[PDB]
Every structure is written in structure tokens, then in C-alpha cells.
Amino acid sequence: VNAGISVSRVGGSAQTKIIKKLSGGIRTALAQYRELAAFAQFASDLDEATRKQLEHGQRVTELMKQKQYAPYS
Amino acid sequence: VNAGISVSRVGGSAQTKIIKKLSGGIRTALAQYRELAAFAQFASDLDEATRKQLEHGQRVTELMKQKQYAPYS
Amino acid sequence: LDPLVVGQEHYEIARAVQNVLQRYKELKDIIAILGMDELAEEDKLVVYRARKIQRFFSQPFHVAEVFTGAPGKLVPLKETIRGFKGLLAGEYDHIPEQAFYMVGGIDEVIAKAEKL
Amino acid sequence: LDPLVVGQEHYEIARAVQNVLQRYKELKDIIAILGMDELAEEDKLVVYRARKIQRFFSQPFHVAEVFTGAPGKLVPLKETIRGFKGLLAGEYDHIPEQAFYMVGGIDEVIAKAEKL
Amino acid sequence: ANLKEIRAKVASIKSTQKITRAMQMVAASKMRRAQERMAQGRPYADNMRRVIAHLVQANPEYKHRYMVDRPVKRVGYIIVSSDRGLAGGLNINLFKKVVQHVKAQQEQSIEVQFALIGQKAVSFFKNYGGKVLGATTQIGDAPSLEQLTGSVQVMLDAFDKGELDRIYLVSNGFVNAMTQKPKVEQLVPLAP
Amino acid sequence: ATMQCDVVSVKESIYSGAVTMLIAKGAGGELGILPGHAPLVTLLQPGPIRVLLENGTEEIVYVSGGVLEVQPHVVTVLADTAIRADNLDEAAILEARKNAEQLLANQKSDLDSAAALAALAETAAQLETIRKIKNRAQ
């Protein structure tokens, strides 16, 4: 899924309290990742908070894959 | 206005004698300023002459702007 | 959007705000590449101003998905311009952007800064 | 292309191969723009890996010798799998890329390289 | 149609073109600056070696460890590089040549020790492994003697221990304004 | 008379020209030097060295480490840090020099990075996006 562009104008109003609460942190993590990705071609020149954001965002990029026929609870 | 592309196919022959006389220096100053637009960031590894051209071009650029409803003699 | 229809001061304050913002955006490249340190304090006050202005943009809507009690701010334009020009001047460039966040008038910003 | 069908190793080896090629194609733009040297070492390694992969695909066909003359090949899938895995293992990073062009199995690659 | 972003890309590339031109002529000015900075310090070492030679011919009574090579067990390398890339593989060619040379020396079953100048080599050789003895950062495009004083002093001390017995510069020779060649040469065992 | 005396730091020369009278404090004692003096080499001690010019006035040059050589006609001063000065207080200007160098290094790091690395990413934005939509016959 191209998370950069895909949206749900309805919003989490149909999402459970817990998942909706947890959503925002992941949302902003991916936002940061895609935002700073312009210079991701070289992580050798940036500051270190940028490296931390890089690593956290790429890890959140990880954990996103999923096998088919697997009904994740 | 962009002077780099706008033009009158008649030339100063339709200007005023004194205006026709004097406008050429401004025109070539603008030409030079356009030639040296990129170097505005440094202004410090140049020779004096190029810097002076840059300064005068900035000055004439500043001059070029005029407000609205401002007829001039 | 004219120094006549909105008055010259309002027009020029808008000019100044937009200049601070576009200066910040043109800064973002050096901000990302070099970081925040190698850039001298010049334009760093501009970065602070742009961020605290963006956060200053926050008006708690009287209907807003409910986060701040859903109040109607509608602060008078005079207070808005006074606060924005004071921010552009740097009068409160010593005060965190969060003070400007989710708040309206300068009274709200200052009380928030006392809170945070 | 099913892991329950193709066998796990087949599936994963194929996926890794496509992944390598994907990065190489992506970086083609910058490497055309910039110097190949001004890049991260792992990037360049992957580049050479993928190029040798491309070459290792190049195969003579039993009827293709009509316009070439080189005898065509028929490579058992086992040889293919083992050779590609060995490449992806980097067991051959010291090997000239020419040693993979217009070949069949990995043993042919060994013969070509030691010949070269 | 969608021509718009194509036009935008074209304009951006044109701007980058003028950017590169400005950058390159600025670099040319800086290169002439350094290249005239070359010879200014020559007469210093010229006359200094001159009186050194006068001394040694006057006093051939001995040759110090700083003029004649003792059998080497570890060889030191002073490696200069930059902190800003975008200079081709010049630094990279230097790194390749010095790695080749040090590998050639390792067959002699002798350790190698390092003197680091510039972030390029800093990264390259903190990745390359070995036993570094000193690392330097931010030469500035005009350096200070004190900046490299302690760096070279450590190298001299390691020579005094008898651990380092031959000491190498790792730099790039100015062939001409366009051509540049990497160079790795020992200096402490003084050549005639 | 006149001797051609030269004062030079490792970076570049500081003083050159004819001089009449040289007063320094060598590795040993202080000495006075006039043209025709014997060939000698001395180690410069930290401090300023003062020499008398043909005009009747006297120059002074500071030294912090260095060596001194004298010949009947020529004097060379290979000083570590050779500074045209009168007092050991040039700390106010050496720091200025270092700040100039580091500032210009900052300019290097900015303009190399800010111009190129930004533009480096920018120029490589969407090339393949356009390359694939060539073969569109529509």
C-alpha cells in the first residue's frame, strides 16, 4: 500500500479506542520518514537526531509486511 | 516583467532622444546582472569587478520596482 | 489583499510573516543536510519565528473534533496583528512554540508559556 | 510463483534477486548523474552484483547459434539455483564480470573466469 | 498533456547548470589560490635542507634514526583527505592506492599504523580497520601548523619507541591543473 | 653596513631586506650582529627580535620557536611562528586568523552541501517517471 497518498476521509471514528490512540505516533513517524527521505540517499552527512528518525521510521516501515490468508487479530 | 524575453521590434527609434541616449547603460547593466545571478550566494570568492557589477545590478533591480497608480514624469 | 483594503500595516505584517516562512522553507535544505548547529544564529531566530508562527496559527475551533473543549476563538484582528508583529520582531523569540500552540491571543500565548 | 508450490528456497532466492535488480534500476538515475565512485560502498557492491546477475542470465540457445555459432545450452534448474545463490552470497565478488556473459551453468562461469 | 512538471524539471536543471558553473569557477579561483600557495613555503625547507646537508657533510660522524632506516616491524602512514566530497575519486584513488600498498606490505608480516587527515579518510579507514594512532578533522581550507603539530608528534614518538620504523605520507601529487596523481612515499628514513 | 637579512615562518616570509644591526637572544646569550660577521647558527628563543635598519630606525619581530643563521652578508631566520610584532600579545590576532579560516571552512561546507547536495537530490527527482511515459503512444 502506498501510504503516502492513501487516505480515509471518514477517520478513526469507526476505529477502536486503543488502535485509534496508537495510530497517531505511527502516522507521524511515517510522515517524518517520507519527509526526510529526500536526503536518505546518504545518511553520512546529516545530524544524529536525523539518524534516529531514520532508524525508527525504517523500523516502522518494517513490521508492515504481511502474508496472505493470515487474519491478523 | 522579464526583460530577457520582452522586446519591441521598433527599438529606441520610438523613445525620447535623451531616453534613447541613456537607457543603453541600464540595459547592459541588467544583462550583466542576469549573467551573474548564480553567484549571489558567495559574493566572497569573486574579484572586485564582478562584485561591483553584481552590486550595481542589485541596485538597478531595486530601482526597477514601482508601486501602483504611480505615474512618473 | 492590499495595503488599502486591509491597511498598510496589516498588508506589511502579512508580507513579513510570509517572508519568514519562505525563508524557513529555503532553510530546510541546510537544516536537513548540515543539521541545526553549523548554521549560525543568523536566520535561526527566523527558524524559531517560523515555527512559533506555524504553531501560533492554531485556533481551537468551536467545533474541532474535540481536543481543547471546542471553544470559539475569533480573536479580534487587532490583537492578532499585534501578536504576530511582536513575534516577527522577536519580542517573544525566547518563548517556546508550544506557548503559541493551540492558543489564540497573546494573553493566551503568555498564559500558556507560564503553564508550560 | 507459490512458496507452497515452488519450494521455499526457490521463492526466496527469486525475491532477493528481484530486490537487488530493483535497487540497481532505481540508482541508475543518480549513477548516470553522479560519479559511480561518490556512492556508498555497499551500493556499488550491489551494483556489480546485479550486473553480474544480468550477465549470468545471458544464455546461448540451441537454435541461436545460427547468428552466432556458439553452441546453445540447456541448464538444469538446480545449477541455476545454486549459481544464483552463490552470487547472492558474494562468493564471486573477486571475479571479473565478463566471466558471466553468454554462459550457462555456474561451472561454465568458473571455467570462463579461470580461463580469463 | 501534463507538460507542466516537465517544464519545471527543465527549469530546475537549467538553474542547477548555472549553479555548477558558478561552483566550478569558484573552485578554480580557490585552486589558483592553493597553487600559488604551493611555492611560497619552498625556500624555507630549501635553505633548511641546505644547511642540514652542510652539517652532515661537515659532521658525517653518525646518522640518526631520522636519516637512516632501521628494520621495520610497523610502518606508519600519514593519510590526508577531505571533509567535502564531490571531487571525483581523487580521494578514492588515493585510498585505493594506499590500500594496495599496505596490502603489499602486509605480506612482509608487519603491522601498519595510521595518521588520519580529513573526514574522507576518517570514514574510509575507521571502516578499513587496523591500528590508527591519530585522527584529525576540519583542516579548513587554510590550516594551522599547531593543527598538525601533535598529530605528527605522536608519529615521531611512535618512531622513538622503535615500533614505527618507517613513516609514509599518503597524499595526491599535483600533476597539473587537470591531472592529479595519488602518492604514498616514506619520508622519515631520509632519502639521499 | 648592510646585510641581507630575511625573517620567514614556515608558512611564508615575514621580513626581508638589508639590515645593519641585529640584536637577539640566541640559544645561548644575546648577541649583536653586523655585516661581515662569522658563520653561525643559533636557536631562537621565544620572544621578540629587534634589528636596526638603514634609515636609523629599528624593527622588532616576535619569535615563538625557531632557528637563526648568520653569514657575513646574509641572515636567514627560520622561525616556527614568525610574527611582525613588538610584544607577546598577538593572541588577539592569531585567534582572528583562526576564526577567519574556520569561517571560510564553514562557507565551504555550506555552499558545497547547500547548493549541490540539495540540487543533487532535486535533479534526480522523477526521471524514470518520465522515461516510462515516452512509449505511451496515446
CSV table of C-alpha atoms in Angstrom, one decimal, chain D residues 15-97:
chain,number,residue,atom,x,y,z
D,15,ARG,CA,12.5,-12.5,-4.4
D,16,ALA,CA,16.0,-11.4,-3.3
D,17,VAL,CA,17.2,-11.3,-6.9
D,18,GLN,CA,14.3,-9.1,-8.0
D,19,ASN,CA,15.0,-6.9,-5.0
D,20,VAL,CA,18.7,-6.4,-6.0
D,21,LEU,CA,17.7,-5.6,-9.6
D,22,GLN,CA,15.1,-3.1,-8.3
D,23,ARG,CA,17.7,-1.1,-6.3
D,24,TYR,CA,20.1,-1.2,-9.2
D,25,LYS,CA,17.4,0.2,-11.6
D,26,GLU,CA,16.5,2.9,-9.1
D,27,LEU,CA,20.1,4.0,-8.5
D,28,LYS,CA,20.6,4.1,-12.3
D,29,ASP,CA,19.4,7.7,-12.4
D,30,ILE,CA,21.9,9.1,-9.9
D,31,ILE,CA,24.8,7.0,-11.2
D,32,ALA,CA,24.1,8.5,-14.6
D,33,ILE,CA,24.1,11.9,-13.0
D,34,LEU,CA,26.9,11.5,-10.4
D,35,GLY,CA,30.2,9.7,-10.4
D,36,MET,CA,29.9,6.0,-9.6
D,37,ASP,CA,32.7,6.5,-7.0
D,38,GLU,CA,30.8,9.1,-4.9
D,39,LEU,CA,28.5,6.4,-3.7
D,40,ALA,CA,28.3,4.1,-0.6
D,41,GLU,CA,30.4,1.0,-0.9
D,42,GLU,CA,27.5,-1.4,-0.3
D,43,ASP,CA,25.6,0.4,-3.0
D,44,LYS,CA,28.4,-0.2,-5.5
D,45,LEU,CA,28.8,-3.8,-4.4
D,46,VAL,CA,25.1,-4.3,-5.1
D,47,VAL,CA,25.5,-2.6,-8.5
D,48,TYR,CA,28.3,-5.1,-9.5
D,49,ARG,CA,26.2,-8.0,-8.1
D,50,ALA,CA,23.2,-7.0,-10.2
D,51,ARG,CA,25.3,-6.5,-13.4
D,52,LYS,CA,26.9,-9.9,-12.9
D,53,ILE,CA,23.4,-11.3,-12.4
D,54,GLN,CA,22.3,-9.8,-15.8
D,55,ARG,CA,25.3,-11.4,-17.4
D,56,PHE,CA,24.6,-14.7,-15.7
D,57,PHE,CA,21.2,-14.6,-17.4
D,58,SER,CA,22.7,-14.3,-20.9
D,59,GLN,CA,22.4,-17.8,-22.4
D,60,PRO,CA,23.2,-19.4,-25.8
D,61,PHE,CA,20.2,-21.2,-27.4
D,62,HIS,CA,20.3,-24.3,-29.4
D,63,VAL,CA,18.9,-22.6,-32.5
D,64,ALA,CA,20.5,-19.2,-31.7
D,65,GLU,CA,23.9,-20.4,-32.9
D,66,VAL,CA,22.6,-19.6,-36.3
D,67,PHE,CA,23.5,-16.0,-36.0
D,68,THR,CA,26.4,-16.6,-33.6
D,69,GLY,CA,27.8,-20.1,-33.8
D,70,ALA,CA,28.3,-20.6,-30.1
D,71,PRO,CA,26.5,-23.9,-29.1
D,72,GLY,CA,23.3,-23.4,-27.2
D,73,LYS,CA,22.8,-24.6,-23.7
D,74,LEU,CA,20.2,-26.3,-21.5
D,75,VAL,CA,20.8,-25.5,-17.8
D,76,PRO,CA,19.1,-27.7,-15.2
D,77,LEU,CA,17.2,-25.6,-12.6
D,78,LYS,CA,19.4,-26.9,-9.8
D,79,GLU,CA,22.5,-25.4,-11.4
D,80,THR,CA,20.7,-22.2,-11.9
D,81,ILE,CA,19.5,-22.0,-8.2
D,82,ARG,CA,22.9,-22.9,-6.8
D,83,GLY,CA,24.7,-20.4,-9.0
D,84,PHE,CA,22.4,-17.5,-8.3
D,85,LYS,CA,22.5,-18.3,-4.6
D,86,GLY,CA,26.3,-18.3,-4.7
D,87,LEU,CA,26.3,-15.0,-6.5
D,88,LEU,CA,23.9,-13.6,-3.9
D,89,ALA,CA,26.3,-15.0,-1.3
D,90,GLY,CA,29.0,-12.8,-2.9
D,91,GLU,CA,31.2,-15.9,-3.3
D,92,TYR,CA,32.4,-14.3,-6.5
D,93,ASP,CA,32.9,-10.6,-5.9
D,94,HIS,CA,36.6,-11.1,-6.9
D,95,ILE,CA,35.5,-12.4,-10.3
D,96,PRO,CA,35.5,-10.3,-13.5
D,97,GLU,CA,32.0,-9.6,-14.8
